[PDB]
Amino acid sequence: RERLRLRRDFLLIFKEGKSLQNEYFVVLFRKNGLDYSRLGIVVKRKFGKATRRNKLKRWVREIFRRNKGVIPKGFDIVVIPRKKLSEEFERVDFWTVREKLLNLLKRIE
Numbered sequence: 001r002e003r004l005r006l007r008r009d010f011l012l013i014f015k016e017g018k019s020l021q022n023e024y025f026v027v028l029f030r031k032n033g034l035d036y037s038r039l040g041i042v043v044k045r046k047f048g049k050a051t052r053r054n055k056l057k058r059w060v061r062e063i064f065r066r067n068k069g070v071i072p073k074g075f076d077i078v079v080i081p082r083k084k085l086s087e088e089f090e091r092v093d094f095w096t097v098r099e100k101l102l103n104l105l106k107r108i109e
Contacts, residue, residue: 002034006042006078020104020108021082022100026080038075040079042078062094075108
């Protein structure tokens, strides 16, 4: 699968894509002309130090990978955690994060 390079495509997705959000996530998305969707994760430095940002990224990649069947195909998708998720990240359970992220991803059109 062609890799989604945020170093090359974040600006394009931000300028030409659409956006959805809830309490925990902003999701930016753009049709990619492919028969599959691709994930990028953009974590602001203030979310936490590297190990914490890496745990968030791991959770998001797991949610995406393990539930690819319900995610609309043909989009480049950028997931951005919000301040409220940073604040609750030490307490929140993975399954709640999963529910909130999949709620958004299923509404991509």
